[PDB]
Design a binder for this molecule. Sequence first.
Ligand SMILES: C[C@]1(P(=O)(O)O)C[C@H](O)N(O)C1=O
Ligand SMILES: C[C@]1(P(=O)(O)O)C[C@H](O)N(O)C1=O
Ligand SMILES: [Mg+2]
Ligand SMILES: [Mg+2]
Ligand SMILES: [Mg+2]
Ligand SMILES: [Mg+2]
Lengths: 433, 433
Amino acid sequence: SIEKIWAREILDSRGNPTVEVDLYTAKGLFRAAVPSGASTGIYEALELRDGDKQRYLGKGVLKAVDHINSTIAPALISSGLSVVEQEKLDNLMLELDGTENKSKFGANAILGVSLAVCKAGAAERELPLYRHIAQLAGNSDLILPVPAFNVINGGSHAGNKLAMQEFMILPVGAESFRDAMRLGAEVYHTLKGVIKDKYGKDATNVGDEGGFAPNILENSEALELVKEAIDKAGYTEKIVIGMDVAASEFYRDGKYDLDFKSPTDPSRYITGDQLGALYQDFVRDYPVVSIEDPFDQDDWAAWSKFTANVGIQIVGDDLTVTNPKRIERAVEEKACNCLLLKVNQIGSVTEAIQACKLAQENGWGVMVSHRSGETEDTFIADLVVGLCTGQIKTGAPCRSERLAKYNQLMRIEEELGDEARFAGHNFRNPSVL
Amino acid sequence: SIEKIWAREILDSRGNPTVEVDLYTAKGLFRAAVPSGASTGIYEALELRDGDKQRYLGKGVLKAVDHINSTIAPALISSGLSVVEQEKLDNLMLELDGTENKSKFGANAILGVSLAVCKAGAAERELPLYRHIAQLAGNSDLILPVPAFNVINGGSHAGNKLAMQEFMILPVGAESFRDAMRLGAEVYHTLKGVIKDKYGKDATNVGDEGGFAPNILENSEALELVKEAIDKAGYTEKIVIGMDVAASEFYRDGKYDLDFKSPTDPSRYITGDQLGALYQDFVRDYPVVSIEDPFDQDDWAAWSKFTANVGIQIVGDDLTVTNPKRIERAVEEKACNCLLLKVNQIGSVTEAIQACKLAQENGWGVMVSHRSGETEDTFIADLVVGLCTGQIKTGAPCRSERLAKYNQLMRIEEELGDEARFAGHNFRNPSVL
Ligand SMILES: C[C@]1(P(=O)(O)O)C[C@H](O)N(O)C1=O
Ligand SMILES: C[C@]1(P(=O)(O)O)C[C@H](O)N(O)C1=O
Ligand SMILES: [Mg+2]
Ligand SMILES: [Mg+2]
Ligand SMILES: [Mg+2]
Ligand SMILES: [Mg+2]
């Protein structure tokens, strides 16, 4: 079935090397590329980098690329398996690597091939990608997700003092996915004007995922700006707010530092209980319906307590790392109620689908996500539709490594035509539709 | 030959609507999308917007989309013309529109179809797109271009006081195109560090094309920053500097305002002779080998005079707007010696190729270019190779609406094998290769 596999080094959206794979069958060429995180969990599958400091400051992926071209490719070509057999092909790669964290080939080597196999398998079945994915997962009623656009940014890879990472808007009230795009774009452009007038003409350049990074410290101030943009755009009834705290980035000596990008002073640090109290203030005062990584990735007690005391969506990202073993624990301890699905945290399509289904079988929500380093690849657009999760976050409506996904979801909606169902207010549980 | 043509509204890289066209033949689906400028010349073909202030702040393109779906599509289908007939199909669309500047359907409507036809035509010919373009243009050779990366920005769409629009790096001394990408990315990442250290960690958010906008006024200081980054990265002998002044943006009453983003003060203004004297200093003191739009789009006297007094490349952008009639005037008056090629400045593939051939026959260089509003489309990567121009500017190595083109050029280089040649130091006159 597989005739040829050829990998290369391309540049991702931040200008860093990443893996791209060309897989050939009788039906042609199938291409996929691998994304790369900025604030990665310590439990993520291994991203293999060259570490040659003379080349791309040690960020090359020539080794991953060679593993694919020289070792993985002949193995899969010899397998006598059809590209539709995703699970058997992924399992072959997992055994050939043979390590728990994919540290021999790199998660980025294995994922690249996994994604290309999946696209080739869709064509072999004569199906669009999202339909092939639905069938791999045992689904049949497709769903267009609510997009979650980050519009204000802070955290460890933003230049301001704002400690929490992402402030997102979700047009739960839009009529369709195409309508949701209009709502998101209009509020984003509105917000640009708001920030410009208040903070200055130089305050509206964008961060890695297209969000604004005004120089503020107060997290409540970010929320106030977002709420202001929504209202001024005219969509108070139709748009709500999500947050990615990424609290692992500012966990310090059992406590949390909301001014961690200023010179270190431990008198600043607060306990998780204080932090929890802050979140409760946010949920009271703003339409915050979802909070991601509110506590450190190892701070299991704090997660379980906070989740037990709120009625909103609580999302595991660095806590769960799209990893069935960590997810089973989180389910048992009721640490959260939503999984952030990132295929390159676990490193294969089959495992990501397994992680999604384990979440869903235990009544969790699932939100498909980009990484900070993205590409022109639009795989996750089909993935979120085929897995029917009802929610995706894949950037501000700015920069085309983000828009390529949102544009593709508009095409899918169009293609499904009258069978298109938008998750809307059922983004947490879209199966009821 | 054309079975179906369907147009839709997608979002470009700034989050504004633009035109995308799907064209179906017997060989499948061929998709293209239209870019949009931020500092457009007054003589560019018309970009048709809806102007509905309630929807996308006036920037919808539903009217242009309807012109394609209702009018252009059935006409071209009923013509029975083969997609290999680029000129005949383009000419038919010009006839239907019937206006000089494509103001009936919009240059964006017409170009959308023109691009998709070209891709479909390549498939019909069973050629890669760059080879089909080469045949259309009457070329037999192919060359990989030197990339020009916009790394420091000022001008009318940057929040600093810096007047001149773009400061670019060109790895003329690279060994290959793929090597040129490494050189550019490394200098780009080095520059980010230089800016962070000199202007603060909050000064490194990116503009529309992925470059930095530090808060500076003097244009010489921008050149200082770029030189310092080149030297720090260790590539002094291999990377040179290009400028896009975009002087039409700060032309005022026959003079030029190098502080036009400060409250208006006519005592500030300088003459074209003084501005030319300033450029002379830059060319003496920095490795500037190319200056684009050094004077206003109508200031023919200043262009001719400057061009006669320097040995560097002088690029017409807003001066020439990819338009054979204005190019003929510039040729006659020796206003410049290079054409910036922007397919949507003129509105069709056929007219753009005509523009290119006219420049080359009169000994001009041609630099293929992006617009500020780009998409995930990679047509101009194939275009610059098929036209053999030896130079492209399509952004900083940041944001995938820019990387998509750079990545595609790496793929083409790889595809051409040992037949691939890199323009290098012959970027102005690649025909000697
Ligand atoms: C910064 C990011 P990653 O790059 O994935 O670490 C972006 C994503 O939105 N997310 O959840 C994050 O934590
Ligand atoms: C600002 C831009 P456009 O959007 O084309 O006006 C970008 C391009 O680099 N260029 O030459 C310009 O003048
Ligand atoms: Mg992270
Ligand atoms: Mg996260
Ligand atoms: Mg311009
Ligand atoms: Mg220009």
